């Protein structure tokens, strides 16, 4: 449920230096923190966010006992984020001149998250550190820090100017701050951070060290504080004697804006002065007025119209027996084409929570489907009043979990029976060999995957499925700009959004000559 | 065309031979043809209620038309199908309906095919709508209508040739004849088909009438492009394509509101005025607002539209990605179909065909940025090449083109609770494999019907036609529990013994 997040940002002087052509790490960290706080505020999440700055000229922290934990200030205590915090992040916070050890900052964040959560109930405690690791540190309290994280159940995430591992584009896909630029002090900081992440989580902790540019195009900041979906309990039935207790979650479900635009008067900025009403008028002349109680619902049947009252429809409606998840049969996986998937969601089906027998039975079914290369056609009804659907449940096996993925299949009435002219058989639209070779070269040049050497693994150069929806961040930016400066036009779309929405520059550069050949080989004329 | 309608005229002979029968169990040709027309009417009402249907009888004693030709009775003119026409046709259905038809319209009179086709042509020309198809279904069971008289037959062939010239498709729906219909005696040179595919004598009647009696209830929406966008390679090589929905969730028709007494459609108007004077609030004196807990953010409607604007409508080719990188479980919304258009950018079809061929050869998909229309945030889509597929009957099962697959964003995927993996022993997997092999079946896309929609159609038909009791639609999505219980047998018990402990439900 509610979670307590502490953002420990680096502010000292070394975080302000910039290589020309590359944005300063201070600005990138500010952008990442702004995105995080924007999402937290404008989604009205109940998570409480703190903000600790280390490296500032001043010193204001609970552990400031004198000649210790200096140049560290707790800018914002644990509370619900508000527009004020966004205002300080965007304008008030300024880079400092001193330096501080990031372990001291981690200890300060520990104390903030410890002696500010008593009384309040928090499901998760998270700390996100933004730093450049260019400052000298002392590894004297490392064991105590690790033990404190382990005992207090506090996560960790590290953000660095350089990725762990052409011109540099912030938020884009491709190379980042050069791997040679990392200095010896930065190397020592990186190795200490890596050892901390290893001792904290394990080998997967290496995946929790991100870069600012790659963080601006991922949801890694919200990964540890997001609330998982609720399960839908049912029973997988094969016949009237076999039943497996299952729980189904929603894997893919398009996210839309939750807050609605409220229509208000332009003079008073209030909504009670504006209301909407509907007037019922006969289609005949003179536009007579009809009240709600004098209208009965009817249906269209050819050229005639038949009255069909709501009570009559409810009595005549197709009655479903209720919630069900029943297997109709098993068919070869090649018979269920991917192009026929319907619906607006994808369900992943596990066994019932902490149920060993159900887990064994479901794993047996999944492995049986996988070995025979078959899928299950199931009848799925969410609720008693829900319209029953027919869908496909195909096995999905990974190195750590197994599940059945359910996608709705079409009914015979959802299929459209148009016919299209054949393209291959056409003698007027047949490309010649030169055009085919040109298109072949173009496809080769614009490849979005790298066939890695020494292993049969395809690396995705443009993994779009990890890119956040740009509309939400754009809307949050516009809303914040309007709230802070309600006298200016909407700002332009941020450059990193365009960078993260565009393919790597290598793809574009490699596809200039082939594209010119395509242009000079395919005459395209826009009809008047 | 798109706005064009389909015009169908049922030409039913009223000769005495049509009222005979070779067996009491068998239906006489007249009521069989009447049931044919009734099935067509019902299917068209469910599907294509915007089309035109007419019914004409020739060979009757009484005459009714716009020309006053003898022995021609136009029961219905070219008009949209309705329940009243269905009931009027039902008045002649079956036994005692044939008697009513013979009592109110004559039969056994001499006719002339040229006059019949003249009446049909006048019926086609009288109505003022724009139509794509002008079809005639001739219901008869006489090989040579004018076998004895040569002049009338010759005039008939001349008139049929004229109607073919002006665009009237003439079909033939012969009923049962004791001596065999013997097509190609007279009808060969008039029927609009290219040739008589079967030149036999056709002792039987069910040539294609079984297709007509077979009722399938589906809307059958006309073909129309969702958007005529532009596929841009970089910024200059721009081809014109069209987006179609090959699959779309069929919705129940929306109920209409009508007057309580007169039963006439009622128009709905919405108006907004301030609650201080009642003066209508023109959409230029109001603003959009959002209160985020304590602070109100005020934006013009133009600003709210502008903040959603990223790119111009069209598809921006980002690159090409191997098909193996497109995961099956990353389904977001139903995929679309991309087909080239030569009406806007001449030469688009050649480049589209080359791209399709090369993508099929290399098993790649064109990853593009999709903006369906103005002021809409873009998505990332994959154009997967889709080769034309023809079955054994050489029909287009799958059209050639591209399949536009929507790729989910990072926030369209939900994190899921951690679960300890509990694998199964090979014995249990083998038992479940046997169970799976027992219940194997062949799946086709058009194998299941929407029970809700079918029940709604049956209820509407019963209400309109005043049926005593509505027909209950058969729910094919219900598992055949008895059948699979008999098919499996003791496999379920053995599987439960292997997996489920003896104290589990």
């Amino acid at each position: 449920n509610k979670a307590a997040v502490v953002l420990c940002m680096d502010v000292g002087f070394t975080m302000s230096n910039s290589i020309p052509g590359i944005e300063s790490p201070f600005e990138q960290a500010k952008k990442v923190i702004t995105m995080f706080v924007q999402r937290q505020v404008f989604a009205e999440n109940k998570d409480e966010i703190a903000l600790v700055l280390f490296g500032t000229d001043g010193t204001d922290n609970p552990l400031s006992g004198g000649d210790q934990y200096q140049n560290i200030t707790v800018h914002r205590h644990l509370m619900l984020p508000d527009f004020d915090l966004l205002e300080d992040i965007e304008s008030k916070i300024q880079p400092g001149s001193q330096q501080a050890d990031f372990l001291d900052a981690l200890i300060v964040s520990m104390d903030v998250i410890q002696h500010e959560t008593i009384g309040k109930k928090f499901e998760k405690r998270h700390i996100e550190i933004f730093t450049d690791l260019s400052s000298r540190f002392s590894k004297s309290q490392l064991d105590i820090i690790i033990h404190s994280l382990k005992k207090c159940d506090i996560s960790l995430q590290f953000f660095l100017p350089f990725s762990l591992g052409g011109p540099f584009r912030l938020g884009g896909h491709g190379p980042s701050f050069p791997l040679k630029g990392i200095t010896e002090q930065q190397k020592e900081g990186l190795e200490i951070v890596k050892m901390v992440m290893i001792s904290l989580e394990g080998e997967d902790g290496l995946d929790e060290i991100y870069s600012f540019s790659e963080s601006l195009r991922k949801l890694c900041v919200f990964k540890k504080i997001e609330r998982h979906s609720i399960h839908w309990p049912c029973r997988l039935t094969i016949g009237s004697n076999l039943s497996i207790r299952i729980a189904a979650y929603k894997s893919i479900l398009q996210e839309r804006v939750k807050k609605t635009w409220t229509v208000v008067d332009a003079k008073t900025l209030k909504k009670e002065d504006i209301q909407k009403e509907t007037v019922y008028c006969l289609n005949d002349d003179d536009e007579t007025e009809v009240l709600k109680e004098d209208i009965i619902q009817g249906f269209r049947y050819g050229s005639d119209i038949v009255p069909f009252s709501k009570v009559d429809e409810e009595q005549m409606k197709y009655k479903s027996e209720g919630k069900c998840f029943s297997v109709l049969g098993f068919c070869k996986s090649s018979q269920v084409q991917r192009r026929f998937f319907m619906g607006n969601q994808v369900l992943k089906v596990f066994a019932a929570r902490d149920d060993e027998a159900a887990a064994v039975a479901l794993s047996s079914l999944i492995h049986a489907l996988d070995d025979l290369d078959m899928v299950a056609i199931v009848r799925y009804a969410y609720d008693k009043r829900a319209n029953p659907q027919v869908g496909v449940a195909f096995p999905h096996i990974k190195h750590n979990y197994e599940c059945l993925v359910y996608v709705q299949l079409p009914f015979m009435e959802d299929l459209r029976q148009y016919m299209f002219s054949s393209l291959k058989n056409s003698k007027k639209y047949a490309p010649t060999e030169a055009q085919l070779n040109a298109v072949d070269a173009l496809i080769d040049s614009m490849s979005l995957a790298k066939k890695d050497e020494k292993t049969d693994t395809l690396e995705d150069l443009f993994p779009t499925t990890k890119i956040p929806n740009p509309r939400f961040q754009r809307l949050f930016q516009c809303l914040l700009h309007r709230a802070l400066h309600p006298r200016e036009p909407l700002p332009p779309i941020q450059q990193h959004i365009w960078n993260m929405l565009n393919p790597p520059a290598e793809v574009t550069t490699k596809s200039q000559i082939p594209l010119s050949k395509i242009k000079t080989l395919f005459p395209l004329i826009e009809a008047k | 065309k798109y706005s064009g309608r389909d015009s169908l005229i049922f030409l039913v002979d009223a000769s005495k031979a049509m009222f005979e029968s070779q067996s009491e169990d068998e239906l006489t040709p007249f009521d069989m043809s009447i049931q044919c027309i009734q099935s067509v009417y019902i299917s068209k009402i469910i599907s294509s209620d915007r089309d035109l249907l007419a019914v004409v009888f020739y060979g009757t004693e009484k005459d009714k038309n716009s020309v006053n030709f003898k022995n021609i009775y136009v029961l219905q003119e070219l008009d949209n199908p309705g329940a009243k026409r269905i009931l009027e046709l039902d008045q002649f259905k079956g036994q005692q309906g044939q008697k009513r038809f013979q009592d109110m319209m004559g039969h056994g009179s001499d006719y002339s095919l040229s006059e019949v086709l003249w009446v049909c042509a006048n019926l086609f020309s009288d109505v003022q709508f724009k139509m794509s198809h002008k079809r005639i279904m001739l219901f008869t069971n006489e090989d040579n209508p004018h076998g004895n008289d040569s002049a009338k037959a010759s005039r008939a062939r001349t008139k049929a040739g004229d109607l073919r010239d002006t665009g009237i498709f003439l079909d033939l729906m012969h009923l049962k004849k004791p001596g065999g219909f013997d097509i190609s005696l007279f009808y060969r040179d008039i029927i609009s088909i290219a040739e008589d595919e079967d030149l036999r004598v056709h002792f039987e009647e069910s040539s294609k009438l079984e297709d007509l009696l077979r009722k399938v209830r589906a809307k059958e929406t006309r073909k129309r492009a969702l958007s005529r966008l532009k596929l841009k390679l970089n910024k200059d090589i721009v081809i014109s394509v069209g987006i179609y929905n090959l699959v779309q969730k069929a919705l129940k028709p929306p109920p209409i509101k009508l007057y309580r007494e007169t039963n006439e459609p009622v128009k709905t108007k919405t108006r907004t005025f301030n609650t201080s004077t009642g003066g209508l609030l023109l959409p230029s004196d109001t603003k959009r607002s959002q209160i985020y807990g304590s602070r109100q953010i005020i934006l013009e409607k133009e600003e709210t539209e502008e903040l959603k604007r990223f790119d111009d409508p069209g598809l921006m080719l980002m690159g090409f990605k191997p098909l193996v990188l497109l995961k099956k479980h990353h389904y977001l919304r139903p995929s679309l179909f991309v087909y080239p258009e030569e009406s806007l950018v001449i030469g688009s079809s050649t480049l589209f065909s080359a791209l399709l061929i090369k993508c099929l050869e290399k098993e790649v998909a064109a990853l593009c940025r999709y903006t369906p229309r103005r002021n809409i945030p873009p998505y990332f889509v994959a154009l997967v090449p889709q080769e034309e597929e023809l079955d054994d009957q050489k029909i287009q099962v799958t059209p050639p083109g591209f399949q536009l697959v929507f790729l989910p964003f990072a926030d369209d995927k939900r994190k899921m609770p951690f679960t300890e993996k509990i694998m199964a022993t090979p014995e249990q997997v083998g038992k479940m494999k046997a169970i799976v092999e027992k219940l194997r079946f062949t799946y086709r896309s058009d194998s299941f019907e929407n029970p809700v929609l079918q029940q709604h159609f049956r209820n509407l038909e019963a209400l309109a036609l005043d049926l005593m009791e509505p027909e209950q639609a058969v729910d094919l999505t219900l598992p055949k529990v008895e059948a699979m219980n008999k098919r499996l047998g003791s496999l379920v018990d053995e599987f439960k013994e292997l997996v489920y402990p003896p104290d589990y439900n």
Binding site: - | L476, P479, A483
Partner: peptide
């Protein structure tokens, strides 16, 4: 055109559903 429906010209003929039929 092969496989064209008689009721609705320009469209493909819809075959009966059939449902699930075990082998």
């Amino acid at each position: 055109c092969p496989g064209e429906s008689l009721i609705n010209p320009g469209f493909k003929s819809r075959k009966p559903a059939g449902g699930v039929d075990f082998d």
